[PDB]
Amino acid sequence: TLKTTVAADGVNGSSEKEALVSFENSKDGVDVKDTIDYKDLVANEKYNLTGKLMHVKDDGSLEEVATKTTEVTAVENGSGQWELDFGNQKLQVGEKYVVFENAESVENLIDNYELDTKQVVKHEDKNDKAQTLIVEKP
């Protein structure tokens, strides 16, 4: 599985409280990074990690703000931590954003008498506060 924690200008989200960006701290944009704790992957195998920063609307709908894909590798016992840095994002005051993550193995790792499918493990939950930031109103 994947668990994720967003950081907005260094301020972490948690399961009970979104990362808050003050109104003043929003001026120059917001540096958005995400930490990904993974388990039950395949040791030493490479994965394509795609992270998306989604604007969460009041009506529950999403709009993609940013996307980034990097190659990462699982370490010992298929568990460990990765990071994904979206860099500076020019986010809207008053709005809420959430980070989605999708890890897909480069090689076939899952099964016609051969492995034929890539392992996909994702965490795409628009309700997960640990992955969420809010840019505070004045």
Side-chain angles (χ1 to χ4, degrees), residues 1-26 28-38 40-57 59-76 78-111 114-138:
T1 49
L2 312 179
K3 293 161 56 264
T4 67
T5 309
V6 70
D9 295 334
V11 177
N12 292 321
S14 86
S15 199
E16 64 173 338
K17 180 190 177 177
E18 302 85 351
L20 295 180
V21 181
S22 70
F23 169 69
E24 297 185 353
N25 279 213
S26 78
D28 52 346
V30 181
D31 304 338
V32 180
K33 293 179 206 210
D34 197 55
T35 301
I36 306 89
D37 296 308
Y38 62 89
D40 286 304
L41 302 193
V42 177
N44 308 307
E45 287 293 327
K46 292 193 298 194
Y47 292 77
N48 316 131
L49 179 66
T50 298
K52 293 177 181 301
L53 185 60
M54 306 301 291
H55 178 202
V56 184
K57 298 187 137 186
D59 68 13
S61 75
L62 305 173
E63 321 195 349
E64 186 178 288
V65 177
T67 188
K68 187 168 161 65
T69 300
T70 57
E71 299 267 56
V72 296
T73 308
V75 299
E76 295 95 341
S79 64
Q81 193 177 84
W82 296 314
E83 295 184 30
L84 185 141
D85 189 352
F86 292 102
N88 182 275
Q89 297 290 321
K90 297 278 174 79
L91 305 184
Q92 284 167 220
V93 165
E95 300 301 305
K96 182 191 277 185
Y97 303 84
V98 64
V99 179
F100 283 6
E101 293 287 5
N102 186 99
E104 177 196 51
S105 64
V106 173
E107 307 290 340
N108 288 329
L109 297 174
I110 292 171
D111 183 349
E114 67 195 338
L115 302 179
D116 59 20
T117 300
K118 301 170 189 181
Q119 185 182 28
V120 170
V121 186
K122 70 194 55 195
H123 188 67
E124 303 179 329
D125 182 355
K126 71 177 162 203
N127 300 129
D128 180 1
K129 298 180 170 175
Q131 301 287 12
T132 304
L133 72 89
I134 294 167
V135 187
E136 300 173 315
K137 299 196 292 203

